[PDB]
Nucleic acid binder design. Structure first.
Ligand SMILES: [Ca+2]
Ligand SMILES: [Ca+2]
Ligand SMILES: [Zn+2]
Ligand SMILES: [Zn+2]
Ligand SMILES: [Zn+2]
Ligand SMILES: [Zn+2]
Lengths: 270, 84, 276, 84
DNA sequence: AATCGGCAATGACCTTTGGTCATTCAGCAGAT
């Protein structure tokens, strides 16, 4: 595929600030811009949110870290259509609002555990106290816990916040990317930290340790066999060189950015 | 055999065929395994064609796998997939 | 005591029709008159119920069958202050505070009917609103301790299939008029014969002689023979339900004592009931 | 030997004392047992005094009963009582 | 004096135009 892993892509839970019982599920790489579309300040809002008496809307929660627009668009469909989403791996093939906030939370809790989405490098954000409360209430009643890998974060107002504190670009990894460009432009990649084989410039996919100040590089297929030391998609892992913990999602963001988004990198480094 | 055991055995053949294929020399041409490792959305009929053109027979499985069976495989491994 | 068992004495649950959260607990032998007092059509009402913003009030449920006014006042105090009421047999000696919620009234009323001090009283629970009756059933379903089958829980919702609800509850002894008339004819003419339990002759005026409650049946017995026959349970003193050895009909101990104390201590309410 | 069992044995002596007393010959003057069967509200210090005036000794219990113990007994029996 | 849990009222939905379902969203009375 021609594109790198997107900076930000989200599936969000929109709610009316006027009737809390009115909800809506969507996806966007630009949460602030899309919220303005729902509130009528920018053309392009959905039909359900068009209603004057329901504006303004708010984004009370969202899942981010989807590694493609397709991945987000599929999670968004399964969350909008819980009665049609079959979570057993299957050979298969306006918006009606959700029933309640409690059903969105239960189905979101379900979706983050089903095999289709269990290993995606995702993260849940909660921006309102009462929505986060219903989430914790369901999590405590449930027996099957969530991945420790799956970070669930909050950002309540008080003490730029919410979707307006989410970075819409590649700035959060800009240091990591800078480390990457200089390691490979000057051919300082050495040997694979796993198989101990020399890695000539341009010889397959060479992934870079995400911890700052460490220059450990390895063949992509070696890095994954190391994290998984059955299963295909790695999640969390430790660098054999620096000993630091790594998320497999961040390591792929940089690799695809270095390999398929060269123009995106030069713009980041300015 | 069991219907869920014919699957668990088939799925290890697809896995072995996928993970034992040579890694790319041109990073712009990743193998099917590296496409999954980088979360490339998998086009089902393309991987199905790849598995049914020597890779399954290579790993000791005489038999053609169905596209929807490759889809089941991707869903069970959290591998992003899609139809064409 | 001196007075017979009352015709009707109740402990009720008052609720506002303007705010369902406002509740009140009372006791009365005349539910209809006491409602009119709460709502300001009759002098003598409560102070918590004086707010005309909260009126009209209604009686959503009540417990009837209390054999004493004292028995009602005790049960009413326990239902009013569940946080002070010790339900373990204790060597010890009006909601101005309204009850927390209907669920808490339902839950505490359910408890009061099961504890030793009130368990074997000849009580009966009435429900007049569907939603209060549903809260009650919701609690009984969750609870693992069943109420005794001997204790009746009845409903009377408006309409269906007139005076309904509390206005259908009889205020006098008319419900037992035949039974009382059967007793007078039996004893005025010395037809009690011998005790159906111990087989001993019972001369007129020789102790307390209780009469079977079933229509047309003669069974008279010594008061303490009936009870020993009824209780023939574990450790108990107060019978609840029994069977007549003569006619085989099932009896409630409370109904029989109501006639006994009428014939024995309430001779002039008898003559007014029979108009004799 | 036990405080829950001795209170059970004490209550058996009170029960037998009440239950085995002769019955009323004048229905206007019922025995304590017949007062309970008719739901007469039981004045505690009255029944208390009656049990300690030879009744407990009659049914084989040397010792005095306290009105609170008689109150516990009544409440355990659903017998309605009161303080004078 | 500010909170407070539980209600009464209200809005949205998809039409069976009103019986659902949810909410308390710039509420609400009453009680502490
Ligand atoms: Ca904050
Ligand atoms: Ca002695
Ligand atoms: Zn290697
Ligand atoms: Zn490292
Ligand atoms: Zn007899
Ligand atoms: Zn009979």
């Amino acid at each position: 595929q021609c594109k790198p892993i997107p900076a930000l892509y989200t599936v969000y839970v929109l709610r009316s600030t006027v009737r809390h019982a009115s909800l809506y599920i969507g996806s966007t790489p630009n949460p602030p811009r899309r919220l303005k579309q729902h509130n009528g300040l920018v053309p392009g809002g959905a039909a359900r949110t068009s209603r004057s008496s329901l504006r303004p809307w708010e984004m009370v929660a969202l899942v981010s870290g989807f590694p493609s627009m397709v991945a987000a668009l599929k999670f968004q469909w399964a969350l909008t259509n819980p009665h049609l989403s079959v979570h057993i791996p299957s050979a298969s093939r306006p918006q009606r609002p959700p029933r309640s906030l409690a059903s969105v939370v239960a189905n979101l809790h379900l979706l983050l555990r089903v095999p289709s989405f269990a290993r995606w490098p995702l993260r849940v954000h909660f921006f309102r106290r009462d929505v986060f409360a219903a989430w914790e209430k369901w999590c405590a009643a449930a027996s099957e816990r969530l991945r420790p890998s799956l970070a669930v974060v909050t950002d309540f107002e008080g003490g730029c916040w919410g979707i307006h504190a989410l970075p819409l670009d590649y700035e959060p990894i800009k240091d990591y990317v800078a480390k990457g460009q200089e390691i490979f432009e000057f051919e300082r990649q050495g040997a694979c930290v796993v198989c101990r084989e020399e890695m000539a410039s341009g010889d397959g996919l060479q992934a870079l340790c995400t911890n700052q100040g460490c220059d450990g590089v390895g063949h992509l297929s070696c890095w994954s066999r190391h994290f998984l030391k059955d299963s295909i998609l790695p999640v969390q892992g430790q660098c054999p060189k620096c000993g630091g913990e790594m998320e497999w999602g961040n390591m792929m963001k940089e690799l695809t950015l270095r390999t398929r988004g060269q123009k995106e990198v030069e713009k980041l480094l300015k | 055999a069991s219907p869920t055991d014919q699957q668990v055995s088939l799925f290890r053949y697809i896995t072995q065929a996928v993970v034992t294929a040579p890694r790319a020399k041109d990073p712009a041409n990743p193998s099917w395994h590296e496409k999954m490792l980088m979360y490339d959305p998998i086009i089902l009929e393309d991987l199905t064609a790849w598995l049914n053109s020597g890779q399954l027979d290579r790993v000791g499985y005489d038999g053609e796998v169905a596209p929807g069976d490759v889809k089941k495989w991707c869903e069970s491994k959290s591998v992003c997939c899609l139809w064409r």
